[PDB]
Write a protein that binds this DNA or RNA. Structure first.
Ligand SMILES: Nc1ncnc2c1ncn2[C@H]1C[C@H](O)[C@@H](COP(=O)(O)OP(=O)(O)OP(=O)(O)O)O1
Ligand SMILES: [Ca+2]
Ligand SMILES: [Ca+2]
Ligand SMILES: [Ca+2]
Ligand SMILES: [Ca+2]
Ligand SMILES: [Ca+2]
Ligand SMILES: [Ca+2]
Ligand SMILES: [Ca+2]
Length: 901
DNA sequence: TCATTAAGCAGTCCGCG
DNA sequence: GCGGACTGCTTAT
């Protein structure tokens, strides 16, 4: 096989590399890598190295990396550009792996671990590590085994061995329901003292040294705790054995309002799964406890135990250990679904970076671009210092608040990366500037043509047309990869809808799910077989289809994220190719493009309907437009349609055969106007929305910018078995909104869009009557909790104290003295509830850590003093009044003349 | 929450005769 | 009460 790196580090004048050799063996080497950097040199000197602007460079070969680093400094002292890759390990990887890396994940040791620490006096601080580690579960991807290190003897209690037999039993038998598919994969090791446990763990670690190290909060808790505990017990040199190169560093993580300390293990790639989840999942969750995320992702039930976690080991050690094993497994189950490890390896090896650098699009793109240029013997510029400056973004149209019955939306494919490619926007393709007219003048095609030579953006920037810049070239490659995975995702989605239809008529038989690739549209034969399957098989197939769709979603949306972040990096001062001219050239071009096509679509439709000045485009945001289709439907007349699917077909056909060609013509004209390199403005029909045929549903509504709801029948070629609510920005979509209120508001919207005013009034009336029964957690608001200290004045709200912070302070007084009650953690999330006048807490609200039950001694008081009236008005009625006043509907029946009888 | 602009709403503080 | 100046937080893109 072709070799690939596993990890790479720089330690002084040495590169330390762990790699897979041509035989599949993991190896490690120390290499005295001699880096090269570059300086400009006279034109009259023969060279093969040129900077990105075509200026000649001389290569400087250094005896060692420290010499290269010192040279960079002296070049700053002289005031001359020191060119080339200054991150020497990236240069090492580029020299060592000078081909497209083909990796084999089955050779990469992925470790997933979790530790338990019994602590009576509150949260066990990883920097102190004053309490024994009493359980470690460490899953190894190469062995496919869960290694369980169990401490039987502690200052906090001596316990019996964990029993695998009881762990396997159902909870109804007194067991722990450890999933049977992992029972045989458990290797259990009990220890009668902590020192031998940790010593054996380190020997184990040495034998099976993680390459990828993951788990849940392992970077902030598990790793620093293990490291510091071993340090406290044995000394530093022993703790450093967690690094295969025996080097570690306490790294300070600086945010906006303070800092925390992580341990950097040289030669390990730490990908904390919480951090992967936050970056790649595209969710915002009310809580990030493993129980909460597990329930959300896998629909598995919460890990149930009596009493505090600090008493679980002594009271029920059996369950203590089993829950530790399950926690590690749940992360593996999340990854099996979401596939973020796979994604990280894909991206990491593509860019030729340390795998942990996938969190940084700036680092990722710096390495892609460097490797690309190096192939042509071109030399990257030195990174420079820049002040942070604001710059303009996307255009968002102000919509008229209203109901909108029939809506068809159109959308530009991967807009900003398409703009980069169309205009040819790159650091080295800048050709000059032109005198800019007001944007309006370009939108309306009255401004002078910017250039007859160069490719232009309406911000005044001109670009070369003779050859692609490195940014357009490299963005296209990832764009094309994305397209492939998006294809699989959509096929899987369309396949899901076929199964859902079939499920309406399941066959009474015993059979099996079909062995099929869900990434490809089902053949006619597969469709025929599906129509004969039982519910059991169909549901299994549905689960598999939806799993395939999720996998495709991960692959496509995060490739989209990486390419959009290249645009974003152009506006980040730390990016090597930071340039606000280029960042603004993209956004301004986008502003023109959207408003240009709004004008074109209006003109086209006014033409077909024989009108003038009618506004068909009701809304747009960045890259997409929403067109009122009422007049199109009215032109054939509703009574002419057989069913809903009939007008959806008609609108689908009108969009594809009439509107898309007109939209294309508009954009091709715009391309010529800006003299762009290549026409890449591809705007296709996105959504078809409207009420069910012959219903009183309103179909859709806008309340404002970034706030709307549509009843969608077809989305990007997926024809849904059941209409799907597309709701953007409204309270149903916000993590801050109580769970039960999201649900209620969503049902209110469903009724508005599908059934109409009367149905909405029925539901509202019932919700208002019953809501006081809802579980307190489900009706709690959620908020992140920053700067608690800032607003804490002697335990009371200081000036300008936010409502949620006030709640936390109330909570802190209620639990005062109690080290055992959960503390609210700065920067994490809290549930928030209002409190009625004259309550014992002495304030108008209380807040406690999210994803948790509030502590028992104050729970009964919270439940007794909860202000349901304020809760209802703030979270439910206020937003609903916003939806209904926009839609010109009443959520409560107005009095009529019929009330006389 | 270490990690690539537009614009909405909640809430504080305070003016608005 | 609302709405502007402002902080805080959270979405859409
Ligand atoms: N997370 C982000 N970071 C930077 N720019 C973004 C981000 N999300 C969106 N944008 C910008 C760049 C996008 O091209 C543009 C419109 O985004 P969006 O509507 O999500 O889809 P898209 O047009 O980029 O891709 P698609 O092909 O899926 O439509 O807005
Ligand atoms: Ca735990
Ligand atoms: Ca788009
Ligand atoms: Ca699209
Ligand atoms: Ca059937
Ligand atoms: Ca869009
Ligand atoms: Ca098209
Ligand atoms: Ca009480």
């Amino acid at each position: 096989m072709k070799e690939f790196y596993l990890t790479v580090e720089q330690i002084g004048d040495s590169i330390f590399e762990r790699y897979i050799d041509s035989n599949g063996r993991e190896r490690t080497r120390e290499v005295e890598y001699k880096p090269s950097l570059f300086a400009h040199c006279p034109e009259s000197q023969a060279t093969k190295y040129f900077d990105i602007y075509g200026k000649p460079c001389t290569r400087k070969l250094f005896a060692n990396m420290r010499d290269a680093s010192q040279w960079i400094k002296r070049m700053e002292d002289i005031g001359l550009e020191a060119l080339g890759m200054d991150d020497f390990k990236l240069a090492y990887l580029s020299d060592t792996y000078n081909y497209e890396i083909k990796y084999d994940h089955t050779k990469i040791r992925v470790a997933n671990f979790d530790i338990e620490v019994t602590s009576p006096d509150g949260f066990p601080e990883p920097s102190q590590a004053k309490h024994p580690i009493d359980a470690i579960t460490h899953y190894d991807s190469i062995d496919d085994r869960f290694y369980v290190f169990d401490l039987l003897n502690s200052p906090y209690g001596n316990v019996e061995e964990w029993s695998i037999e009881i762990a396997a039993k159902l909870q109804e038998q007194g067991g722990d329901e450890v999933p049977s598919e992992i029972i045989d994969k458990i290797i259990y090791m009990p220890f009668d003292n902590e020192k031998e446990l940790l010593m054996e763990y380190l020997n184990f670690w040495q034998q099976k040294t993680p390459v990828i190290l993951t788990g849940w909060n392992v970077e902030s808790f598990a790793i620093p705790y293990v490291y510091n505990r071993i340090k406290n017990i044995f000394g530093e040199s022993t703790a450093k054995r967690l690094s295969p190169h025996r080097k570690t560093r306490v790294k300070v993580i600086e945010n906006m309002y303070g800092s925390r300390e992580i341990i950097t293990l040289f030669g390990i790639s730490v990908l904390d799964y919480i951090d992967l989840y936050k970056k790649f999942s595209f969710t915002n969750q009310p809580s990030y406890s493993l129980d909460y995320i597990s329930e959300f992702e896998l629909n598995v039930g919460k890990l149930k135990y009596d009493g505090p976690i600090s008493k679980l080991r002594e009271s029920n050690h059996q369950r203590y250990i089993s829950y530790n094993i399950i926690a590690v497994y749940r992360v593996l189950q999340i990854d099996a679904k979401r596939q973020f490890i796979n994604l990280s390896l894909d991206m990491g090896y593509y860019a030729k970076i340390q795998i942990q650098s996938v969190f940084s699009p700036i680092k990722t793109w710096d390495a892609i671009i460097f490797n690309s240029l190096k192939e042509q013997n071109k030399v990257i510029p030195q990174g420079r210092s820049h002040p942070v400056q604001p710059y303009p973004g996307a255009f968002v149209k102000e919509p008229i608040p209203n109901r909108y019955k029939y809506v068809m939306s159109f959308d530009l494919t991967s807009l900003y990366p398409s703009i980069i490619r169309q205009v040819n926007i790159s650091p080295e393709t800048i050709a000059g500037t032109f005198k800019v007219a007001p944007l309006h003048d370009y939108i309306n095609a009255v401004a002078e043509r910017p250039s007859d030579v160069y490719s232009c953006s309406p911000n005044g920037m001109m670009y070369y047309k003779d050859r692609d810049g490195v940014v357009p070239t490299e963005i296209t490659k990832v764009f094309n990869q994305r397209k492939e995975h998006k294809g699989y995702m959509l096929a899987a989605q369309r396949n899901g809808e076929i199964i859902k239809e079939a499920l309406h008529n399941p066959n009474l038989s015993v059979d099996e799910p079909l062995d099929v690739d869900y990434r490809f549209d089902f053949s006619d034969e597969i469709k025929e077989k599906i129509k004969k399957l039982s519910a059991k098989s169909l549901n299994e197939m549905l689960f598999r289809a939806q799993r395939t769709e999720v996998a495709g979603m991960t692959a496509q949306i995060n490739r989209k994220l990486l390419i959009n972040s290249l645009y974003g990096a152009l506006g980040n001062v730390w990016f090597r190719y930071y340039d606000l001219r280029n960042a603004t050239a993209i956004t301004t071009f986008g502003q023109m493009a959207l408003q240009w096509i709004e004008r074109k679509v209006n003109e086209y439709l006014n033409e077909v309907c024989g009108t003038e000045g009618e506004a068909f485009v009701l809304y747009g945001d960045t890259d997409s437009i929403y067109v009122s289709a009422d007049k199109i439907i009215d032109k054939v007349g509703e009574s002419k349609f057989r069913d809903t699917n009939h007008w959806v077909d008609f609108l689908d056909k009108f969009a594809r055969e009439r509107m898309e060609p007109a939209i294309d013509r508009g954009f091709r004209e715009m391309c010529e106007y800006m003299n762009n390199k290549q026409h890449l403005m591809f705007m296709d029909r996105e959504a078809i929305a409207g009420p069910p045929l012959g219903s009183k549903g309103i179909g859709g509504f806008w309340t404002g910018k970034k706030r709307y709801a549509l009843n969608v029948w077809d989305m990007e070629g997926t024809r849904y078995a059941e209409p799907k609510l597309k709701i953007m920005g409204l309270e149903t979509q916000k993590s801050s909104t109580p769970k039960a209120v999201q649900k209620a508001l969503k049902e209110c919207i469903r009724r508005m869009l599908q059934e109409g005013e009367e149905s909405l009034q029925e539901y509202f009336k019932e919700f208002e009557k019953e809501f006081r029964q809802l579980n307190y957690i489900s009706i709690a608001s959620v908020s992140s909790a920053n700067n608690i200290a800032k607003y804490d004045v002697g335990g009371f709200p200081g000036p300008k104290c936010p409502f949620h912070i006030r709640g936390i302070l109330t909570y802190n007084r209620a639990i005062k003295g109690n080290i055992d009650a959960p503390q609210v953690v700065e920067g994490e999330k809290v549930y928030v509830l209002p409190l009625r006048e004259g309550n014992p807490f002495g304030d108008k609200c209380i807040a406690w850590p999210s994803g948790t039950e509030i502590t028992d001694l104050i729970k009964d008081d919270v439940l007794h003093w909860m202000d349901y009236t304020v809760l209802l008005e703030k979270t439910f009625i206020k937003p609903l009044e916003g939806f209904t006043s926009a839609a010109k509907l009443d959520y409560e029946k107005k009095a009529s003349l019929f009330d006389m009888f």
